[PDB]
Structure formats: C-alpha cells, structure tokens
Amino acid sequence: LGSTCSSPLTHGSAAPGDPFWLQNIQHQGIAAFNGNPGGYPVFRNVKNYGAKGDGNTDDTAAIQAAINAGGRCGQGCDSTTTQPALVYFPPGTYKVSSPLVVLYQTQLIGDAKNLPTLLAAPNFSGIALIDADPYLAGGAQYYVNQNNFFRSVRNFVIDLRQVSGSATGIHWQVSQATSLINIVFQMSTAAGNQHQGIFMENGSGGFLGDLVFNGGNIGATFGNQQFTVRNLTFNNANTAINAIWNWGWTFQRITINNCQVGFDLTQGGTSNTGAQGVGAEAIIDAVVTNTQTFVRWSGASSGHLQGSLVLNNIQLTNVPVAVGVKGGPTVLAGGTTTINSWAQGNVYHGTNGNPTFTQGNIANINRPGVLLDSTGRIVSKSHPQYTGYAPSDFVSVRSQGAKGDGHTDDTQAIKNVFAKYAGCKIIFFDAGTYIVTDTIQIPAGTQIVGEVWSVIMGTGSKFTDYNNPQPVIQVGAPGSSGVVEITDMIFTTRGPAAGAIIVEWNVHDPSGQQAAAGAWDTHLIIGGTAQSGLQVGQCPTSGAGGNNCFADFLGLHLTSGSSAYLEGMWVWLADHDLDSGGSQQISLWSNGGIMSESQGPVWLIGTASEHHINYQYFLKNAANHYIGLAQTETPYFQPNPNPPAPFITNSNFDPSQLGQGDAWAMTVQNSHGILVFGAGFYSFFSAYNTGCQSPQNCQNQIVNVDSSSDIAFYSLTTVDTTWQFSVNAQGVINRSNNPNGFADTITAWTRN
Numbered sequence: 001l002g003s004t005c006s007s008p009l010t011h012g013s014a015a016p017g018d019p020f021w022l023q024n025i026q027h028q029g030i031a032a033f034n035g036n037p038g039g040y041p042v043f044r045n046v047k048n049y050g051a052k053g054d055g056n057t058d059d060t061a062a063i064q065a066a067i068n069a070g071g072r073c074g075q076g077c078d079s080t081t082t083q084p085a086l087v088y089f090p091p092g093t094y095k096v097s098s099p100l101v102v103l104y105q106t107q108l109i110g111d112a113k114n115l116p117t118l119l120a121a122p123n124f125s126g127i128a129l130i131d132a133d134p135y136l137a138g139g140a141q142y143y144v145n146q147n148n149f150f151r152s153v154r155n156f157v158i159d160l161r162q163v164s165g166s167a168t169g170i171h172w173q174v175s176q177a178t179s180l181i182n183i184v185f186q187m188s189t190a191a192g193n194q195h196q197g198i199f200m201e202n203g204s205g206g207f208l209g210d211l212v213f214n215g216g217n218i219g220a221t222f223g224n225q226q227f228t229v230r231n232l233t234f235n236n237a238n239t240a241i242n243a244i245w246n247w248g249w250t251f252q253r254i255t256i257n258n259c260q261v262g263f264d265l266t267q268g269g270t271s272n273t274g275a276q277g278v279g280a281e282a283i284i285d286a287v288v289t290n291t292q293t294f295v296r297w298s299g300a301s302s303g304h305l306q307g308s309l310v311l312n313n314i315q316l317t318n319v320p321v322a323v324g325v326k327g328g329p330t331v332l333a334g335g336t337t338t339i340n341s342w343a344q345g346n347v348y349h350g351t352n353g354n355p356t357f358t359q360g361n362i363a364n365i366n367r368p369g370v371l372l373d374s375t376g377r378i379v380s381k382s383h384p385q386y387t388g389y390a391p392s393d394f395v396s397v398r399s400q401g402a403k404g405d406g407h408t409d410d411t412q413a414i415k416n417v418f419a420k421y422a423g424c425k426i427i428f429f430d431a432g433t434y435i436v437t438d439t440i441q442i443p444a445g446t447q448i449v450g451e452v453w454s455v456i457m458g459t460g461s462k463f464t465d466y467n468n469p470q471p472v473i474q475v476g477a478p479g480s481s482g483v484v485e486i487t488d489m490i491f492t493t494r495g496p497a498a499g500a501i502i503v504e505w506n507v508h509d510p511s512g513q514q515a516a517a518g519a520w521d522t523h524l525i526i527g528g529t530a531q532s533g534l535q536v537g538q539c540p541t542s543g544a545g546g547n548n549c550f551a552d553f554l555g556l557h558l559t560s561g562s563s564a565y566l567e568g569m570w571v572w573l574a575d576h577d578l579d580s581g582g583s584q585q586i587s588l589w590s591n592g593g594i595m596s597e598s599q600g601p602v603w604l605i606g607t608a609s610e611h612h613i614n615y616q617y618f619l620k621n622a623a624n625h626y627i628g629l630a631q632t633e634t635p636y637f638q639p640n641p642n643p644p645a646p647f648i649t650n651s652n653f654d655p656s657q658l659g660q661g662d663a664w665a666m667t668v669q670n671s672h673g674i675l676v677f678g679a680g681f682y683s684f685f686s687a688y689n690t691g692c693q694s695p696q697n698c699q700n701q702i703v704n705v706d707s708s709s710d711i712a713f714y715s716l717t718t719v720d721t722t723w724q725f726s727v728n729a730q731g732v733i734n735r736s737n738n739p740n741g742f743a744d745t746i747t748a749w750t751r752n
C-alpha cells in the first residue's frame with residue numbers, strides 16, 4: 001500500500017449528483033512530439049466550443065471544432081501519434097445534422113453517470129452520425145482502412161428515431177487499437193425502416209463490446225478481416241448482425257431478443273481469387289429469445305467447407321431455426337434448448353491430417369472452471385470507468401512532477417507516485433510521453449488511467465543488452481496478489497533497446513475477485529512513432545540501421561504466478577512508420593511478442609501480437625488460458641534474416657523448435673487447459689516481396705504444439721501458409737484441405 005494512506009481506496013467518494021470525474025479533473029495533457037506542445041489542447045469539452053446540448057440548437061459544427069482544434073491529422077495525412085484529442089461530452093442532447101468526422105487518434109467520451117444523447121436531426125444527411133473514415137470524390141478516403149488505428153467512442157445514446165429515411169449511427173471502418181464501449185443505439189421499429197446501428201465495410205480489427213441496439217432494420221453491418229466482440233445486445237431488430245465478409249471473428253456473450261434473423265452470414269467462394277464472404281464465426285455464450293433464425297447462411301454447404309461456424313453454449317427460447325440456409329433447408333433445428341457444441345466446417349483430431357466435414361454436434365468444448373464466472377460463462381469485464389469516483393480520488397502524475405515531455409527522465413517522479421499513492425488514489429497519467437531509464441514497478445493494488453495518449457517509454461543502458469533482458473514495466477512484485485487495473489496506457493521503448501521486456505506481468509487476482517488484474521485500451525506500440533529512434537530515418541527496410549533498430553527483447557511476459565484479463569491489447573512491433581508521412585515500411589527487431597508461463601486464469605480477449613522474430617505468442621508450461629480471438633502477423637523482412645537473427649538463441653525465452661525461416665504465430669509447450677476460440681494467424685511476405693500471397697506459400701508452418709499439451713483450437717484461420725497446424729514442427733494440417741476464400745480455416749482441432 002502507498003505511503004499516504006492507511007487502507008486501500010476501494011470505492012468512489014462522488015455524490016451521485018456530481019458530474020462524471022473526467023469533466024472537472026485538472027486538464028494537463030501534453031502531445032510531447034507535437035509541433036506546439038505548449039499550445040495544443042489534448043482535452044476538449046464540446047461545450048467550450050459552443051455546443052448547447054439542448055436538443056434544438058444544431059451542435060454539429062461546435063462538436064466538430066472540439067474534434068478539429070489544434071491542426072490535427074485530416075485529409076492528406078496517413079496517420080499520427082502526435083495530434084491526440086479527448087473530445088468530452090457533458091450530459092445533454094446534442095442535435096447533429098451531418099457526420100461528426102472522428103479524426104485519427106480521437107476519443108469521443110460521454111459523461112458515464114448520465115449518458116449524453118447524439119440526436120440525428122430529421123434532415124440528417126451523410127454516411128453515419130459518427131464517421132471514422134470519410135470518403136472523398138473518386139472513392140479516396142482520409143485513411144487506409146487497414147491503417148486506421150486509435151479511435152474510441154464511449155458512453156453515448158445514439159438516437160436515429162427522428163430520421164424518416166435511412167440513417168446509420170457509426171461508420172466504424174477501423175483496425176486495431178480501437179474500441180466502442182457502452183453505447184445504446186435507439187432506432188425506429190417501424191415496418192420497413194432503414195435504420196442501421198453500425199456500418200462496417202472493411203478493416204483489420206479490433207475489439208468492441210458493451211453495446212445495446214434497440215430497433216432498426218440492421219443492428220450492425222460488419223465486414224472486416226477479424227474482430228472480437230463482447231457483450232452486445234440486439235432487441236427488436238430485423239437483422240441483428242448483417243455480416244458481409246471476414247476471415248474470422250469471435251462473438252462472446254451475445255443476446256438477441258425479438259429479431260427476425262440473428263446472424264445473417266454471407267457465404268462466398270473457397271478460392272483466394274474468387275468472391276469473399278464470411279469465412280468464419282466462432283460464437284460463445286449467446287442468449288437468443290423469440291427470434292426466427294439464430295444464424296442464417298446465404299447459401300448451402302455441399303459436403304466440403306465453404307464458410308465455417310462454431311457455436312458454444314447457445315441458449316435458445318422460442319427460436320425455430322438454430323442454423324438455416326436463406327430460403328434453403330434448416331441445418332440445425334432450434335426450439336427451447338441449449339446448444340453445447342456445434343460446428344460446420346472441417347474437424348481434426350491428433351496428428352492425422354484428415355478433414356472431417358461436419359454440420360453437427362461436436363465433442364463438448366472444455367471450458368476450465370477458473371475461466372468461468374459464477375453463472376458459468378467466460379468472464380466479461382468492461383473497461384473500468386470509475387463512475388462513482390470524484391476528481392480528488394485521482395492523483396495527477398503531472399502534479400507530482402512527471403513532465404511527460406518526452407525528454408526529461410521521469411523515472412524518479414513516477415517511482416515516487418507509486419511509492420506514495422498506489423492503492424491510495426487512482427493514478428492518472430495525463431497525456432504525454434514519459435521517459436524512463438529503470439524498471440517501473442506497478443505495485444499490486446494499483447489502478448492506473450491514461451488520457452488518450454499517455455506513454456511510458458523505456459530507454460538507455462538498462463534495456464540495451466539482449467543477454468541480460470530487463471523489464472520496463474513490472475505489473476506487481478513476483479508472488480503478489482491484488483487489484484491491478486490499467487486503462488488507456490501505451491508501453492513502449494526508445495531504441496535501441498535489445499534487452500527490453502516491455503511488460504512483465506506478475507500480479508494474480510486476489511482470492512474471489514476474477515479479472516481484478518487486467519488491462520483495457522492498453523497497447524504496446526513498439527517503434528514507428530515520432531522521436532522513438534525507431535522510424536524510417538533510422539531503420540529502412542534495407543536493414544542498413546543494423547543494431548540501432550533493436551526495439552525490444554519481449555513485448556509481454558506473463559509469469560508463473562500471474563493472472564491477467566487482457567482486452568484489446570495490441571503488441572505491435574511496427575511494420576511501418578506512423579509519423580514520418582507516407583506510411584513508410586521499416587525493419588525493427590523484436591525477439592518475441594507474448595510469452596506466457598502463467599498457471600492462469602488468463603483471458604486474452606481480442607489481443608493481437610505482430611511482427612516479432614521468434615513467435616507472436618509462446619505458451620510455455622502455461623495453464624487455464626482462454627484466448628479469443630487472437631490475431632498475428634509475421635515480420636515483413638523474414639526470411640531475411642531467419643529466426644532467431646539478429647538475436648541469438650535464448651533457452652529461457654525461445655521455443656525448443658525455432659521457426660524455420662519464419663516466426664511461429666503460436667507455439668505451445670507443456671501447457672494444459674488452453675482454449676483458443678477464434679484465431680487469425682497471417683503471413684503476407686517473403687523478404688518484403690508479396691509474390692507468395694497468390695500461391696499461398698509465404699511460410700511453411702505457423703502453429704506448433706508439442707505431444708503433451710492439453711490445448712484445443714476452434715475456428716483457426718491462417719493466411720498464406722502451407723501447413724496451418726503442426727505437432728513437433730512437422731506439418732499435420734495442410735491448407736489445401738481447408739481453403740475458405742482468401743483465408744484457410746480449421747473449424748476444430750483436438751488431441752483426441
């Protein structure tokens with residue numbers, strides 16, 4: 001416990017009529033590498049910019065000034081980490097008449113005690129009320145969709161009910177490090193209405209969750225490579241979810257009430273050169289009441305894989321058809337019953353490479369009990385917002401001497417904040433980049449909250465030696481136990497840093513509090529950013545930067561005694577430079593992404609690990625992990641060089657079987673109770689050349705398990721890899737058995 005208090009802060013001291021803490025907290029954020037750090041406002045209350053919030057004044061332009069202010073990344077800008085914005089909305093109804101354009105690196109945040117309403121005016125015109133990627137003449141857009149990172153919308157009512165024609169709440173054409181949190185969509189239930197909650201046509205996501213859709217023709221149109229979605233509720237919709245295409249997604253905790261169709265799944269072809277539909281859906285813990293068809297496919301499957309589905313723990317009350325083909329036959333009859341485990345697609349057992357095409361119940365999926373809440377469902381825990389906490393329950397790191405200016409060594413000031421306040425106050429990292437040169441231990445008991453772009457950047461000799469790797473952030477002491485919640489933080493390095501273990505996670509849940517230790521909207525954005533030493537000017541794809549371009553030793557280390565509930569975390573070794581303009585590719589060296597030795601419980605919900613040399617995920621003597629969806633990519637420069645280079649073999653942190661030519665997406669040794677429910681593991685290059693994408697042979701193997709591990713894979717999608725699944729570095733499941741569009745999919749694998 002911190003030295004300023006006698007027992008832990010365990011609840012807020014706000015009076016219920018007080019505005020949400022974020023409005024009145026001192027606003028001290030800096031954009032460190034902005035052209036004008038001293039004049040550039042990070043926080044913007046929409047009312048300070050003229051918003052009335054009275055339902056009659058058109059507030060579109062006032063809100064837009066709150067977004068736009070400071071000269072930010074708009075038309076003609078690829079990406080930015082240096083022009084952040086927290087757009088804050090106090091209670092009110094804000095009438096808008098054209099799209100609010102949510103620029104690169106913007107968070108829209110409503111009062112969380114009293115959700116503000118965004119009210120579409122009856123003459124609303126435009127693609128959606130909130131627009132994350134505007135279209136320009138010629139079908140250009142502000143941003144490349146696969147590059148459209150850093151965006152959040154939290155705590156709104158979105159009310160389309162005054163629009164008599166079509167209306168869309170959010171054009172959410174986004175990729176990783178984005179979330180939608182705590183939003184209610186109010187839509188017409190009139191016959192023939194054309195209301196749509198979300199329109200999403202492409203992207204490379206992503207996490208979103210905790211939304212309620214009331215009414216509408218379509219709750220969400222979703223088209224995107226991959227996404228994890230937690231705790232959405234669809235009431236009185238025509239189609240809850242109109243899924244138009246994907247490689248593979250995971251849906252957890254879905255509720256569909258009084259809808260015509262729940263999931264409307266567009267089926268496509270099986271070749272990488274044909275029409276792309278929905279490759280894979282993995283749905284776990286769904287409740288469905290008074291709905292005609294729970295899941296409908298656009299077309300039938302004739303005895304081979306052509307669109308994959310996994311269902312786990314589906315509770316149906318008055319749902320005639322569980323799975324059916326559009327104007328085709330019923331595939332699984334419903335009624336009032338609980339579906340335990342059911343799949344459509346190719347099911348595999350052991351080291352036998354034989355597909356069993358399945359449209360039927362499958363062996364019951366093991367769900368280790370430690371991973372399940374007290375209603376028996378995968379734990380579901382939303383981003384903590386501290387709604388009943390008052391501003392004085394927070395302590396500001398800027399107020400305690402941490403400069404956040406990206407230059408001053410902030411190690412001591414930060415260390416001191418933890419020593420004085422851990423467990424005493426919520427620790428508020430005002431926006432900024434905080435340079436540290438020694439381990440920052442976050443003690444068990446701590447709650448940490450950032451402000452859109454609050455970065456801890458480790459640098460210097462403690463972190464440069466791969467033979468002696470050292471932690472930049474330590475989450476709890478070894479053996480420790482307690483609440484640790486981290487929200488809106490970035491953990492990174494200033495290169496070179498070949499010895500950086502960016503996050504070492506030790507803390508375990510206390511007895512009887514599940515997911516009390518976890519991170520939300522918290523990422524490891526490794527290189528590719530302003531003044532990181534790891535940009536295109538230091539690290540060209542030629543490899544000319546050499547030993548300067550070591551970015552880290554390991555991104556995230558989950559240790560033996562730890563538990564972690566990790567939601568949306570992107571462990572991104574930068575493939576390209578976000579800040580120099582041009583999205584230029586760069587070659588950076590990370591030895592590995594995520595290594596877990598944790599005995600559990602570990603929930604990894606829509607985490608991604610990308611561009612590390614030896615593996616994106618390594619589970620070594622781990623137990624009791626629920627992983628879904630997990631997304632990877634191999635570093636673009638491989639096989640030049642081959643793993644482990646430019647590192648050397650390390651027997652503590654590397655797998656026994658090193659990747660041959662290319663990194664493992666996931667490699668598992670001596671582990672049990674591991675459930676991977678939804679995976680997208682990709683390989684797009686051979687030494688910067690894309691030629692291997694067409695013949696689908698960019699790398700040879702990508703997923704390894706040993707002989708003994710107790711691990712199960714469901715909806716395992718890989719891209720451009722010959723062997724999709726290996727036991728003891730020998731290919732077992734060949735891609736040629738599972739083509740499913742652009743990507744290839746294993747519906748189920750189990751040892752037996």
Ligand SMILES: *[C@@H]1O[C@H](CO)[C@@H](O[C@@H]2O[C@H](CO)[C@@H](O[C@@H]3O[C@H](CO)[C@@H](O)[C@H](O)[C@@H]3O)[C@H](O)[C@H]2NC(C)=O)[C@H](O)[C@H]1NC(C)=O
Pocket residue numbers: 182183184209210211212231253380381382387
């Ligand atoms: C799934 O997401 C929804 C949408 O965010 C979550 O529902 C929300 O839950 C919060 C926290 O329990 C509710 O607030 C509570 O209100 C009661 C009185 O109404 C008060 O006694 C509490 O102190 C608390 O503030 C909130 O109303 C509710 N929001 C909506 C629109 O329903 C839900 O928690 C999520 N479920 C899971 C499993 O994550």
Ligand SMILES: O=C1O[C@H](CO)[C@@H](O)[C@H](O)[C@H]1O
Pocket residue numbers: 146147204575576610633
């Ligand atoms: O698909 C992607 O798009 C990006 C390429 O623009 C890359 O930065 C991400 O790491 C990758 O997931």
Ligand SMILES: [Zn+2]
Pocket residue numbers: 383384385449487488
């Ligand atoms: Zn928060």
